[PDB]
Design a protein around this ligand. Structure first.
Ligand SMILES: CCNc1cc2oc(-c3ccc(F)cc3)c(C(=O)NC)c2cc1-c1ccc(OC)c(C(=O)NC2(c3ncc(F)cn3)CC2)c1
Length: 543
């Protein structure tokens, strides 16, 4: 069947949109930035709709059946509970999109009578009706990118706030338990960046002759079939559950997850979906389990020797025993053919790598830096151009949600985070006098809140003390930040190093947590190094 059907009505915005920042004609830097940086808007929504609309074909085999049976068996050992109406209301984030029924996240969170009783009828309706399609809204995401053409806008498909609370009642406990239970160590979302690196280093070292590859499915959400979604439901039903959860899970699968009509921001019918909805509670878990099932089966079909797998939604990495370059190349082609048969076709074909550092997954790669005594430290990095471009977007566009503080947290050991992002961020917090204030930031389709003064403790907990002493960066990391700065029209590293010395001194002068930030985060900026010791604060819980 077709992944989507369309009526011709536009995917409409709800906010003012901007494809490009206005150019300053007397600035060459403004010109370089204008030539390279763009924001996705509703205007490209139709181009995305064309790319994601296609017929799916699925051919399953004994390799697929065998893997599916094993994950159902592991799922059968899990016991999960219903969340009460109150717990599910409490799990709603402060600014979750308001309901069409005249109530927002504030009424849900505070348990206001009308919001609670509206959700109660949505819940009872799921128990008595297993068939009526649930309506959804389709919206074009506004994301900043750097060219090399332009990526069209990604689409978000989500049900009403009242339905979102009900999904949590039925499946929240499952999302917190099922992935780790059925995938074990392969479950990608259980690791901090230092633990992920440790996992990859152990996977690499345990092979006699390692080979690794990453796989990208072309438009994964659209490749998910109705049969794939009903299979996810049978995985969920393999768990031990209250009968009320079983009924609600079945109704959610048939009325929402398998498909349904999509409406734009104006209430006009946009189309009909017959694939994965991007904005449902089960998107991340469903994608991770389904990608894992299809990939493990494809590994068996291709004759991949001793695979160690790491799965993050549709992002997958397989580290295995190399059979030599010719056989590895034949095996990756057979893996791709099996993946395509299972309806998970490739975007870019996979390539075997014989150095862990050469694999790109979740836009990232492992890099090596030397410590002050010459010890090799391994950490995750990425090309810094798009994160730096996103950081710059907000200097002319003061957004209430920062789209680059997530980079400081995830990529804290990197040259580009330490020298540029940290320097710029702490500078702007001191100019605005917002240092000690909690701020909102986006991280993998979620709006988190963090206090900037807690950054040294958060970083040590997620990366270790090593994040504050990556002394000698690789030639590639050095070239990557220098080219990114040049391409965006930004000042070079020598300027950032001078600015960091002033930022370090200004933070130290404020004392307390601001002085800890200055001493730990900017030790790279001084020749007379302080001896950085473990933070007792890092021995606290962020998760
Ligand atoms: C570093 C850039 N990000 C990432 C870099 C990555 O590089 C590879 C990777 C690269 C090369 C390889 F050869 C193999 C693999 C990844 C992979 O697994 N591909 C299969 C991968 C995933 C993320 C990622 C995604 C979502 C997250 O979050 C959902 C997080 C996170 O770390 N979130 C945080 C947290 N999560 C869990 C936890 F317990 C503590 N902290 C801190 C807030 C990270």
């Amino acid at each position: 069947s077709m992944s989507y059907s369309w009526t011709g009505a536009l995917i409409t915005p709800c906010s003012p949109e901007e494809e490009k920042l206005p150019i300053n004609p007397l600035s060459n830097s403004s010109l370089r930035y204008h030539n390279k940086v763009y924001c996705t808007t509703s205007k490209s929504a139709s181009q995305r709709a064309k790319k994601v609309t296609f017929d799916r074909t699925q051919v399953l085999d004994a390799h697929y059946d065998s893997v599916l049976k094993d994950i159902k068996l592991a799922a059968s050992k899990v016991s999960a509970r219903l969340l009460t109406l109150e717990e599910a209301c409490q799990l709603t984030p402060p600014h979750s999109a308001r309901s069409k029924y005249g109530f927002g996240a504030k009424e849900v969170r505070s348990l206001s009578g009308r919001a609670v009783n509206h959700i109660k009828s949505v819940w009872k309706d799921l128990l008595e009706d297993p068939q009526t399609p649930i309506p959804t809204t389709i919206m074009a995401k506004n994301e900043v990118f750097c060219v090399d053409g332009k990526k069209p806008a990604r689409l978000i498909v989500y049900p009403d706030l009242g339905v979102r609370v009900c999904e949590k009642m039925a499946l929240y406990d499952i999302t917190q338990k099922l992935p780790q239970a059925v995938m074990g160590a392969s479950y990608g979302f259980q690791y901090s960046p230092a633990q992920r690196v440790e996992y990859l280093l152990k996977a690499w070292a345990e092979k006699k002759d390692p080979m690794g590859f990453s796989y990208d499915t072309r438009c994964f959400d659209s490749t998910v079939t109705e049969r794939d979604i009903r299979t996810e439901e049978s995985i969920y039903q393999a768990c031990s559950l209250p009968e009320e959860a079983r009924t609600a899970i079945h109704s959610l699968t048939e009325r929402l997850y398998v498909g349904g009509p999509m409406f734009n921001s104006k209430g006009q019918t946009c189309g009909y979906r017959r694939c994965r909805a991007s904005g449902v509670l089960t998107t991340s878990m469903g994608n991770t389990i389904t990608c894992y099932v299809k990939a493990l089966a494809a590994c068996k079909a291709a004759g991949i020797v001793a695979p160690t797998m790491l799965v993050c939604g549709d992002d997958l990495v397989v580290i295995s025993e190399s059979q030599g370059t010719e056989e590895d190349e034949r095996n990756l082609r057979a893996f791709t053919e099996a993946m395509t048969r299972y309806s998970a076709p490739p975007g870019d074909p996979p390539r075997p790598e014989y150095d862990l550092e050469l694999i790109t997954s979740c836009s990232s790669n492992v890099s090596v830096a030397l410590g002050p005594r010459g010890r090799r430290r391994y950490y995750l990095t990425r090309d810094p151009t798009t994160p730096l471009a996103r950081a710059a977007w907000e200097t002319v566009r003061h957004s209430p949600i920062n789209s680059w503080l997530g980079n400081i947290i995830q990529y804290a050991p990197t040259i580009w985070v330490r020298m540029v992002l940290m320097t710029h961020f702490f500078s702007i917090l001191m100019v605005q006098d917002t240092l000690d204030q909690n701020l909102n930031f986006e991280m993998y389709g979620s709006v988190y809140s963090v206090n900037p003064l807690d950054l040294p403790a958060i970083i040590e907990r997620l990366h270790g003390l090593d994040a504050f002493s990556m002394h000698t960066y690789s030639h590639h990391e050095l070239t990557r930040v220098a080219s990114a700065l040049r391409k965006l029209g930004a000042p070079p590293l020598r300027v950032w190093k001078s600015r960091a010395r002033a930022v370090r001194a200004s933070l130290i002068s404020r004392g307390g947590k601001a002085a800890v930030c200055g001493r730990y985060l900017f030790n790279w900026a001084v020749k007379t190094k302080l001896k950085l010791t473990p933070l007792p604060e890092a021995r606290l819980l962020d998760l």
